[PDB]
From a paper:
Two groups of enzymes, muramidases and N-acetylglucosaminidases, cleave alternate but chemically equivalent glycosidic bonds in the NAG-NAM polymers. The S. aureus Mu50 genome (an MRSA strain with vancomycin-intermediate resistance; VISA) encodes five N-acetyl­glucosaminidases belonging to glycoside hydrolase family 73 (GH73 family). The crystal structure of AtlE and its complexes with substrate fragments described here provide insight into the mechanism of NAG-NAM binding, whereas a comparison with structural data for lysozymes and their complexes with substrate fragments enabled us to seek out the structural differences responsible for docking of the two alternate glycosidic bonds in the NAG-NAM polymer. The compact α-helical structural core forms the lower part of both domains, whereas the R-lobe and L-lobe contain short α-helical and β-strand regions, respectively.
The structure has additional five amino acids (SNAAA) at the N-terminus remaining after cleavage of the His tag by TEV protease. In the MDP complex the NAM and alanine residues are unambiguously resolved by the electron-density map, whereas the positioning of the atoms of the d-glutamic acid residue is less defined, as indicated by the electron-density map. The O atom of the lactyl moiety of the NAM residue forms a hydrogen bond to the OH group of the Tyr201 side chain. The alanine hydrophobic side chain is positioned within the hydrophobic environment formed by the side chains of Ile163, Gly164 and Phe196, whereas the d-glutamic acid residue is disordered and points into the solvent. The superimposed structures show similar positioning of the carbohydrate rings, yet different positions and orientations of the peptidyl extensions (the T4 muropeptide in green is pointing to the right and the AtlE-bound muropeptide MDP in red is pointing to the left), which provide insight into the difference in specificity between N-acetylgluco­s­aminidases and muramidases. The opposite positioning of the lactyl moieties in the active sites of the N-acetylglucosaminidase AtlE and the muramid­ase ACOD predicts that features on the left side of the active-site cleft of AtlE are responsible for the recognition of lactyl moieties and peptides from the glycopeptides, whereas the features on the right side of the active-site cleft of AtlE should prevent the binding of lactyl moieties and peptides attached to them. The reverse is true for ACOD substrate binding. Indeed, Figs. 8(a) and 8(b) show that in the L-lobe and above the −2 and +1 positions of the lactyl moieties of NAM residues bound to the AtlE surface, there is sufficient space to accommodate the peptidyl extensions. The absence of AtlE activity against NAG substrates can be attributed to the extended but not twisted conformation of the NAG substrate, which disables productive binding at the −3 and −2 positions.
Numbering used by the authors: 33 to 78, 83 to 258
The structure:
């Protein structure tokens, strides 16, 4: 069976509302727990969130660096975002947009990485535990993978997204966030607006460069 439609919307909502399941929302400058009604509203299907991001797009290094101009630690790293796109077959507009949301347009202090020994570790995609503490103990995905440079963190993030999400039939933002095939497991983030934020930047970049959209899917539930 290639049939990944497993749950009704109501069944999925109740699972997303389950015990100790971290769903969060930005209010008054920081993240708080989302209520059950906010969760249900967020997972409701309304198209960048629903677009397959497992294909390459024809963006040159010049075009990618345009997008990255004024983006902090990510500025003038378009060549490496493209190396990631071609190596791992990950949409570069998606990849850039995801990094921009997570790193605060490349300007956040956490985007400048975490020191340990003579190395510093970088993480631009919110992958695993990434804080002072976790790097110390070695319970950090970034350290395990030795993302010792920004370029390694770009390539490594794409490798992770491809191998852990795209190869797990989570092919667009909605599936990455809400995993309708298996609700409330293997979800990329706790922010209920995670997909919205990335999708917004993707859509701007699609309309800036006139890029053609890949497949859209809006059917996920019984
Ligand atoms: C991309 C990422 O890290 N999103 C984590 C998410 O973990 C997902 C499922 C994951 O893909 N985790 C990766 C790092 C890993 O491949 N799976 C688990 C790590 C579990 C974790 O991050 O806590 C493992 N192999 O041991 C975790 O559930 C949630 C609440 O803690 O906080 C999100 O920010
Ligand atoms: Cl959780
Ligand atoms: Cl070019
Ligand atoms: Cl993220
Ligand atoms: Cl969403
Ligand atoms: Cl338009
Ligand atoms: Cl389509
Ligand atoms: Cl549906």
């Amino acid at each position: 069976a290639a049939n990944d439609v497993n749950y009704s919307f109501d069944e999925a909502v109740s699972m997303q509302q389950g015990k100790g399941i971290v769903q969060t929302k930005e209010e008054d400058g920081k993240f708080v727990e989302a209520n059950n009604n906010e969760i249900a509203k967020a997972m409701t299907i309304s198209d960048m969130k629903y677009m397959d991001i497992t294909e390459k797009v024809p963006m040159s290094e010049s075009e990618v660096n345009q997008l990255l101009k004024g983006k902090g630690i990510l500025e003038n790293r378009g060549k490496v975002f493209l190396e990631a796109q071609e190596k791992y077959e990950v949409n570069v507009i998606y990849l850039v947009s995801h990094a921009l949301v997570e790193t605060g347009n490349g300007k956040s202090e956490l985007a400048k990485g975490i020191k340990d020994g003579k190395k510093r570790y970088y993480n631009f995609f919110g992958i695993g535990a990434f804080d002072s503490s976790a790097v110390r103990s070695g319970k950090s995905y970034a350290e395990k993978e030795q993302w010792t440079s920004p370029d390694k963190a770009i390539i490594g993030g794409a490798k992770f997204i491809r191998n852990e999400y795209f190869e797990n039939n989570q092919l667009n933002l909605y599936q990455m966030r809400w995993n309708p095939e298996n609700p409330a497991q293997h979800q990329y983030a706790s922010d209920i607006r995670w997909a919205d934020k990335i999708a917004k930047l993707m859509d701007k970049s699609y309309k800036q460069f006139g890029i053609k959209k890949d497949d859209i899917r809006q059917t996920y539930y019984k």
